[PDB]
Amino acid sequence: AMLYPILTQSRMLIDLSGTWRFKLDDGSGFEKKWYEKTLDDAQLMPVPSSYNDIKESADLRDHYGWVFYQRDLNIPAYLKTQRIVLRFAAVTHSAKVYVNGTLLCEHKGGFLPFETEIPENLIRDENLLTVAVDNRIDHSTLPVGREDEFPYTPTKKQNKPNFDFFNYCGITRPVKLYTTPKDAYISDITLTSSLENNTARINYKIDTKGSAHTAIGVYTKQGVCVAQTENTGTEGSLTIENAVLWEPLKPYLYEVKISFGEDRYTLPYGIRSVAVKGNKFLINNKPFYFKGYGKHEDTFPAGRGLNMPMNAKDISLMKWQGANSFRTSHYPYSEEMMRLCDEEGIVVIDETTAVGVHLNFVNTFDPIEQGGIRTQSHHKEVIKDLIARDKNHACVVMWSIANEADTGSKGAYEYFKPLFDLARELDPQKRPCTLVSLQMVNYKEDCTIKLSDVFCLNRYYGWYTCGADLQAAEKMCREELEFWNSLGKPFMYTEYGADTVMGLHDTTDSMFTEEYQVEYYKTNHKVTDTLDCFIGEQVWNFADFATSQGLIRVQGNKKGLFTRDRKPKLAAHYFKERWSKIPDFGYKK
Amino acid sequence: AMLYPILTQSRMLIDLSGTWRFKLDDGSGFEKKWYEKTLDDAQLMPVPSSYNDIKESADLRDHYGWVFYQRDLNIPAYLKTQRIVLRFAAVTHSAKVYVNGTLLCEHKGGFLPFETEIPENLIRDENLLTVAVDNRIDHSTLPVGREDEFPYTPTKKQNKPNFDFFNYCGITRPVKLYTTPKDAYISDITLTSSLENNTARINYKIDTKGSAHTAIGVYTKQGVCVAQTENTGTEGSLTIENAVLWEPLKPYLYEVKISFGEDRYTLPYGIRSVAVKGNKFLINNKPFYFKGYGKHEDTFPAGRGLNMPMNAKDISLMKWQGANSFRTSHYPYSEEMMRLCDEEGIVVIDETTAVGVHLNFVNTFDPIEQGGIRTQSHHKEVIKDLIARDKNHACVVMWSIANEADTGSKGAYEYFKPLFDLARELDPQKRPCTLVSLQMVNYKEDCTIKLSDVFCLNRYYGWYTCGADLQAAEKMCREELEFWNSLGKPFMYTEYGADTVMGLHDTTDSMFTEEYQVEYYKTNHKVTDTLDCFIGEQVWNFADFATSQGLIRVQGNKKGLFTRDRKPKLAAHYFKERWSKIPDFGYKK
């Protein structure tokens, strides 16, 4: 259970972000127990941020292994009357947390929150908070790193990402200290909704620790109570007359206030339905057409780090462009972004960290004993933790189980079936599930056909195939997409695009130019607009972003409609025009 | 024999460049004999120019096969008292020339001149000049095209260059009509020189047609006769007291005036010596250090077409930068450029069209019967024609027989030995010969070791290997170059560089940025500056240039020190500083 920490009448919230001490591990940091004393000969690093781009050092940027963050933690003694909790919104990739040299908790997985109580007896008048952060990736991590997958011997050992984005690490999201009452407090809140005529019934389950009485109340934004049930135990339901539904680009959030003993917590909540029916993706019982992007959490210089002004700018640009949705490629995004999308009416496809589950791009899904991928156990944990964190978001309409796994190979169904079963069991709302499909010659053998509610395709007709032959791209696009269209279920693009360097131009089709980006998209839409079951277009990518170095990466990935500083390329204006003429609902009715 | 056409007291020179009629072949142009009538429904095309980039049409740009050029040719009747000759400085790749529907000549090879007399009886009051131009390349052309070397079927058949520059075709260089006397005229002039104390002896061979008397005279620029021999027949020699030698960056050209019958011709001529001695490249008996580039003939919008303002700009930039030399990668350049280099003092490595002689990047040098490369016969002709055209240029110091052929494979020596023998037999000055060596794991088996006077290496330590690991690049560079340095002969870089998009920057080593280009070069020079036998550095490339489309070509090749419009990147300023501190002679003495 991971409720978003908020300031309430029962809960202090103390942000510990700021300037922290920082030291690269030199191979002796654990042996010499750096976490027991003030870090010596240390640099300074902003928190939250990725550490890789803050300085001008390639050794820092390309570091392999651990780093140590540290700050002083002098807290008011009267907080010891409360339960004191340290929340790490995200530490990428793995973390060990020490208070005063005592290991308090460890965590695997770089993009989901974790927390630990601080034992009263450990707190002294002056305290040290140390966080060791591991950046290493391999066949057991999500995201996956390669291990052995004019030759040269590298100077130093480096991570080998099995994914096309830079391995930004550090204390990515805020660190906060919060409190709750000691004796009785709210642990989790689960809400589902059903529309009966114009009355909405909200089914609640309120998980608590300790012995006390539970109450739930629902308030409009303006502050009018529209439902209240007291001494209700853990499970129950209530009704809202003439409920205002949450709609894409027309958000409405109620305030759900919960009290348990002395503990008080407020959850914003939008009421809406999601259902796949035939070849339709229904939101509030109307056929939606996704218009949007795969994104990244990527800005300069914080890398993956939480950037709230940019989050606000990005949503503003989305609304300027006529988009209604994006996918959290390829990892859960910050709770701050997810709460802003609820507030602004932006639909989200919520994706796990499972990118790179593919050893043949030895078989990927061979037994662990025989060298197959070792991620399934952590993959279940990521699904559990992601749904636990984001289950109550109206903006989340679909779960993406993995990006571009080896789903056309033997064993894939066996790997993914338990994960789809888990996602459907744990999501109280029973939202659609998908995996995002890699382009593949044997696409009719993609195990997504056996598992997903929506077929989400990543296709590069006109870039990675048929480059500079868009007439051939159109023909090959049509041949494959007519297959998917024949299955009768909703399908969409979750990626399609072309690397485009702003400032490069040609009137005559030429890859990497701004004009070719437009013609690439025009050619794809010639096909998709004719296909009844194609219910969404999400470009790759919203904006240019950083990747590992290589001969095909022109200083990162250039498939953005926007540059990294959010300036529109020609194709950004093209999509503003196109999306201005396509309705959010009823385009293909 | 191909003397450069000039206006003389015996020779008219009429430029036929301008706006010509132009038509793509539709598959019926020869069958319907378009060359017998005015071209119907034709476009207009500038001559000289490549045709590919003049319009906005991909079908034109990417055309496969023939096109037809045509213009009217109404010539004064009294030129029929003279011998009338049509000179095509270059038609890329193959040409058929018609006057009034009569085929007058054909030519294979896109970068060297050819000419035909117009029979008096063919000339009418009004005449049509038609030139059919073939752009097709395969295993028999120089440069070589591939034949069979998520798969897709292309919309149209296209050329498949086995080389990294765009296949620009058309009437690349000027078309001119010139005259000579009918009865007796000068066909060729061959000059060699020997320095005895301060007196230069010039050995001449003057090839003529018809019966008349031959005379030779040598004049300073200011117009003073310094030697004259009359009624001298074909071969002879003369002496110049206190001769002024032609030097890199300090040119001096005499004017050699030849008369034969009524025919008169003036040849500019610089006196200088070239010799390889030990690990030294000696010009006028001093150890030269090449500073410069591989170039291309490439400008917008004429493509490969003669651009005399840009030729002057490029030499100016070369002198601004402190360079002293370039290589005519990968084809002979215009005579206009070569004559300007004589006038300006820029040293040239003169290269044939033989790029792409490599079928494994079936064995390249297997018998023609068994599918090996079919270029050796045309390769001999190119060597013959190139040396015939450029033999008298002081600026030409070395012949390059091929760029990046498959010289580490079996049969390579057998292919190249007759060509090196031919080049040494035909060059009256017996200048050094080389081939330009492709980077290759089995570099000790490169047959250049058995054939060349100078080892000319194309190496990309820090780009195509060790990318973003310049410490490893330095180590691998040193290991190989210490081998070449151990052989005791002069060697040099003829290519080394890194794709760099102007405007992309990072303080921390990042491929495609302007800073990485500088660090790439700094790392290579750390090695080359320590190696006694390394006598020259020619970067790839002088300027960004157009290539075929592909995932690693960011709108062409970006390894220029300058952009395509001749603006300096950071590394251009780096080389200005470096070359300002390295002397042309005596750097490694």
Ligand SMILES: CNc1ccc2c(n1)sc1c(N3CCN([C@@H]4O[C@H](C(=O)O)[C@@H](O)[C@H](O)[C@H]4O)CC3)nc(NC)nc12
């Ligand atoms: C195992 N590591 C890898 C990966 C990819 C590649 C290599 N090694 S090697 C190489 C290569 N050769 C390198 C040398 N090259 C010369 O250098 C210039 C240049 O490439 O910039 C060319 O313009 C110039 O005309 C040529 O003389 C001509 C081909 N060419 C291309 N594609 C084009 N890709 C690769």
Ligand SMILES: CNc1ccc2c(n1)sc1c(N3CCN([C@@H]4O[C@H](C(=O)O)[C@@H](O)[C@H](O)[C@H]4O)CC3)nc(NC)nc12
């Ligand atoms: C036979 N023709 C060729 C030649 C080269 C390549 C292909 N086909 S295919 C492919 C590929 N996949 C394509 C799909 N791709 C997704 O699209 C984005 C993107 O590549 O822009 C990624 O950012 C995003 O995270 C990924 O979900 C992830 C890998 N990736 C890379 N290198 C990275 N090269 C190639």
